[PDB]
Design a protein around this ligand. Structure first.
Ligand SMILES: Nc1ncnc2c1ncn2[C@@H]1O[C@H](COP(=O)(O)OP(=O)(O)OP(O)(O)=S)[C@@H](O)[C@H]1O
Ligand SMILES: Nc1ncnc2c1ncn2[C@@H]1O[C@H](COP(=O)(O)OP(=O)(O)OP(O)(O)=S)[C@@H](O)[C@H]1O
Ligand SMILES: Nc1ncnc2c1ncn2[C@@H]1O[C@H](COP(=O)(O)OP(=O)(O)O)[C@@H](O)[C@H]1O
Ligand SMILES: Nc1ncnc2c1ncn2[C@@H]1O[C@H](COP(=O)(O)OP(=O)(O)O)[C@@H](O)[C@H]1O
Lengths: 684, 330, 55, 61, 40
């Protein structure tokens, strides 16, 4: 009897209450019921992108069958599931597979239409070593079999919708990806299920915030499954942190250290210190045990209320009437009020930490998934952002206008105030070369996001060509590098929140700005593989240096505003206005004074002394040599890269020449004292 | 227990997705209201309101061609006059989102031979198992409005593809099946004659405007390709009442996002006047308005939020400074 | 469409909407347990019984 | 035995692919017991068998 | 009983001390148990 040998009744399990009262989708449930209750072709299939729980939709159908929410043609059916792989136990011999399948079909013919078959992953029936559709086909045109299809749309149009007969045995039911509020309601049901399971408490505003942030940011999984998994992960994280106890382990390490110390000693007073710390540890542990007993009582009395709900649903299915009234009017309000009395008792007594999960915990779990701080404005990173310019001016000498602009962009981002449909900020950078445009982006990602590396540089002087555009997008399909993805794009989709440098776009061909039009209007970009990757949670920057001649002229005693206006007219001579109107936010860099050169050189000395302490060397300087270097390392055309190469050619070579002359000892006071044209280091 | 034709049209609509059903009265009220709603969320440009109103009326009444696809529209207008936002408002009416549309971003196509992005790749090259994205996205949502964005950036004769599309709209995809467009709508946006528009939206009617820019785009395209379009509508550079209304709508969605933050925010209408004074230029349209709103509102606002001045449950009148706007807490 | 009509027969729609109405009014009365909601429940249940008998 | 010990026993199986390739041959007999929860076993293999067997059945994924 | 027939207790082996106290990886064991005390 192969039904006993291979299939599992869902309705047994839902009779045992093992499954989810899955909310919603009710039109589609009804339409499934329509297609089932036909006389021919009784088998509709379920369709979509996964992570939508079509499995659970079949489950909820079976639960409504248990509850009798169905029309009068399905009351008493048998909803049973079977794997195609369940009959691939012995696939060498001839017909063995097929004998299993025919024995199944003869069982189902003997059961006479009172059984609804479920199949998951219907594409498993497609190719199994002809094989499988060439036995179902008479039943499935004749509708004597009551299959329920549930599979993923990729496998659907990959396997079935190229095999036409199996296409016409089945009818589409397109489950959508659900909305926001549908997710919210289902997560209220799942809050119920989880606090039944995971022995904890959950904040429901944190739940709706979790749903919001799941739908909002992460496009990796889909609705609602990603929020489901996040709530599960946070529940289990706090569940492990129930038996963390951190301060108890601090006290336990402290008392075992004092015990080892006293046993090594055997004035004393260490006996008194050990007794005090063991009393403290015992008090904390006893408070911990009392909290555990409170939570255990709360969870047990919740489980007893749930078993009362199980019994009153038994009375709903069976139909005793005074049982309903008795179970309700006794069990419900008294157990609810003493569950809330245990809840406020925990709200009193829980110090050693929680049993709730809040949205901060959600953002912790999110950053552990994402790596991106939307862990909220917590007055440390927030007050960093309040000092964000002063953060930058560790490395940002002068140039305060763009510092303001960038911090404005970041503030509109991380306070959550942006229209997120453009990107975080489009930027043109102007001004003299060799100031730290690259330094600006590095320090941006540094004191904002990660580091001086978490970025993509794309140097546009390559990009004089149409095929250069073809590179940075991705190749069209039916060509070479299709199978690998685009230059930019997969690097974006790995690191979802970066800053992108498009340096020196004026050397590129003017075609590129179309690609930037799609971006900097939209922040979504369609690759070679026809699919779209978000940008809008990133920052895009271009640099140019054209009227930096005019800037070096006129930044002396003209404003910021008409300077901006004149150079934007120059940009209108350069670009399309149809593009620069799409540009949000434009700055101008200005030439620096030599005090700024001295400050950057001081920063180079800082990182130099960092490098030399990493070597081990304690090195100071005469700053007359700094004055000489500030005299040396400037031109009006390039500025600070002459200072960098002068630093190299007069510091990094002769100092190593003397260290590898064996002169220098780590730990000695090493003053970089001047020479007539050089710098002497001393050994003191 | 009598099965009528409306029953069939509903079973078809629920079974595919195409809105076949007979014109129920909530829908007909909603169609008159969506004439009104495209006046709402698109201030300006009531030519387009008229044109796309006529398009969907020739759809849902069921009179337009079972040969040609339903609308065919080559938009003309200068920058930022709401073209993309028009089509998004169409979708957000019709499909209750912007993410039910086929937004094939056309300026990727600057050399020819990326047509295989949209059709598929012919058999015995790479993309034979996968299709080309236009065809797949059509055949999943057989009723879906397709937008082709800023289309004339590309290499010119990509649109022999669109000659099929606007002619009969069966589309022989890569593998060799049929992609049918008869329940769909193709819209393009172009900004060719825009300098002539801002030059001569004055001193002309609607018709000679259309005539002269049609001559120009016919110089740009091929005379084959202009013949396929239903109505080459023209957009117009906006006056300052439209600027104020756009500002209001942006303030309303700003209020929306910040009431989702949980803050009750008013404004001085003088602050709106300052915004209106600080957002007008004919050459650039709506974006200096929007980014001026962005800067001169959000940056002190986000500054004071990160100050924590903003207590919820306070009316936040965005009242003026001497030249700027402060938020108040009362 | 045939099984759709069969289910719309076998359901009924407005009858079950009124049934949702009467079970909501029963819940509301027991949440109150002057009444007159007893009378309104009796009226809506008589309406549902008449409709069900016609059904 | 998984039924008997009631989840007080969590068994370990390295080479999850060898449960995938064992002749349901061993795996999808136990995809019930892991799905139903008589067993919460731990996997141990390399990324290649992850893409080869664990990713390739998406239900196993 | 079928238990001893085809099972190998490693916890008996560390219980009888046969085994290797490797150091570290406690975060990974922690994230493992985070998986282990889920419901799905
Ligand atoms: N209405 C609902 N109520 C409760 N849980 C739900 C509901 N809808 C979906 N889920 C959960 O979502 C999980 C994942 O969704 P699935 O339906 O399993 O994904 P799928 O698209 O069916 O592909 P697979 O093969 O089943 S993973 C299910 O196992 C359910 O636990
Ligand atoms: N009548 C209008 N109603 C609403 N928003 C409008 C209106 N006119 C312009 N806009 C705004 O103008 C912008 C237009 O966005 P897009 O349509 O992408 O720009 P565009 O229309 O594509 O212009 P080009 O030529 O492509 S640069 C949006 O920010 C709209 O909100
Ligand atoms: N504002 C600044 N803060 C710190 N260091 C800077 C600053 N501006 C310039 N520098 C220096 O200027 C040089 C400019 O490098 P780069 O950004 O490639 O040139 P440009 O700024 O001309 O594009 C850097 O090597 C760096 O040493
Ligand atoms: N901390 C440790 N204590 C005891 N043995 C260890 C430790 N770290 C590694 N080993 C040894 O290294 C070997 C690695 O084998 P194993 O880890 O089972 O392979 P795999 O890395 O494929 O799981 C083991 O046999 C184990 O005995």
């Amino acid at each position: 009897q192969a039904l006993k040998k291979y299939t599992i009744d869902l309705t047994e399990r839902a009779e045992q209450g093992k499954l989810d009262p899955v909310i919603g989708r009710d039109e589609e449930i009804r339409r499934t019921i329509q297609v089932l209750q036909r006389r021919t072709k009784n088998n509709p299939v379920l369709i979509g992108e996964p992570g939508v729980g079509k499995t659970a939709i079949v489950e909820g159908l079976a639960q409504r069958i248990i509850n009798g929410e169905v029309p009068e043609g399905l009351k008493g059916r048998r909803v049973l599931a079977l794997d195609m792989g369940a009959l691939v136990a012995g696939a060498k011999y001839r017909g063995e597979f097929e004998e299993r399948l025919k024995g199944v079909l003869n069982d189902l013919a003997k059961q006479e239409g009172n059984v609804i078959l479920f199949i998951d992953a219907l594409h498993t029936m497609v190719g199994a070593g002809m094989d499988a559709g060439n036995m179902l086909k008479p039943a499935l045109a004749r509708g004597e079999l009551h299959c329920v299809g549930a599979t993923t749309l990729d496998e659907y149009r990959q396997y079935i919708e190229k095999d036409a007969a199996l296409e016409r045995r089945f009818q589409k039911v397109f489950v959508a990806e659900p909305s926001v509020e549908d997710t919210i309601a289902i997560l209220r049901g799942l809050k119920e299920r989880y606090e039944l399971h995971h022995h904890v408490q959950i904040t429901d505003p944190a739940i709706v915030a979790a749903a919001t942030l799941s739908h909002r940011y992460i496009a990796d999984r889909q609705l609602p499954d990603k929020a489901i998994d996040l709530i599960d992960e946070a529940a289990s994280s706090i569940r492990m942190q129930i038996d963390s106890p951190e301060e108890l382990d601090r006290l336990d390490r402290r008392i075992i250290q004092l015990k080892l110390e006293q046993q090594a000693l055997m004035l004393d007073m260490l006996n008194e210190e050990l007794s005090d710390k063991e009393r403290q540890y015992s008090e904390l542990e006893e408070e911990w045990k009392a909290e555990k007993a409170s939570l255990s009582g709360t969870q047990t009395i919740k489980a007893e209320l749930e078993q009362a709900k199980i019994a009153i649903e038994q009375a709903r299915r069976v139909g005793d009437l005074a049982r309903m009234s008795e179970l309700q009017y006794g069990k419900i309000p008294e157990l609810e009020k003493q569950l809330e009395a245990a809840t406020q008792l925990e709200g009193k007594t829980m110090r050693l930490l929680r049993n709730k999960v809040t949205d901060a915990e959600i953002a912790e779990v999110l950053a552990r998934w994402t790596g991106i701080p939307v862990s909220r404005m917590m007055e440390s990173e927030r007050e960093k952002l309040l000092r964000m310019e002063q953060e930058l001016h560790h490395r940002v000498i002068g140039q305060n206008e763009a510092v303001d602009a960038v911090s404005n962009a970041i503030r509109r981002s991380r306070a959550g105030l942006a229209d997120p449909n453009r990107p975080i900020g489009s930027f043109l950078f102007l001004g003299p070369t060799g100031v730290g445009k690259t330094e600006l982006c590095k320090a941006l990602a540094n004191f904002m996001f990660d580091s001086d590396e978490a970025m993509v540089r794309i140097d546009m002087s390559e990009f004089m060509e149409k095929h250069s555009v073809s590179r940075l997008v991705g190749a069209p399909p039916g060509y070479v590098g299709y199978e690998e993805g685009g230059y930019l794009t997969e690097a974006v989709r790995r690191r979802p929140y970066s800053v992108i440098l498009l340096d020196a776009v004026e050397k590129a061909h003017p075609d590129v700005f179309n690609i930037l039009l799609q971006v900097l209007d939209d922040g979504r970009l369609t690759d070679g593989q026809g699919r779209t990757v978000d940008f809008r949670n990133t920052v895009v920057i271009m640099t140019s240096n054209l009227g930096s001649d005019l800037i070096q002229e006129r930044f002396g005693e003209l404003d910021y505003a008409h300077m901006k206006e004149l150079v934007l007219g120059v940009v209108s001579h350069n670009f399309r206005p149809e593009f620069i109107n799409r540009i949000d936010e434009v700055v101008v860099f200005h030439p620096l004074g030599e005090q700024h050169i001295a400050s950057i050189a001081q920063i180079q000395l800082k990182r130099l002394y960092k490098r030399l302490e990493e070597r081990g060397y304690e090195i100071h300087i005469s700053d007359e040599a700094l004055k000489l270097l500030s005299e040396n390392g400037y031109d009006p055309v390039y500025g600070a890269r002459p200072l960098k190469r002068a630093i190299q050619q007069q510091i990094e070579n002769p100092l190593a020449q003397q260290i590898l002359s064996g002169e220098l000892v780590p730990g000695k006071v090493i003053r970089l004292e001047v020479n007539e044209d050089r710098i002497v280091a001393v050994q003191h």
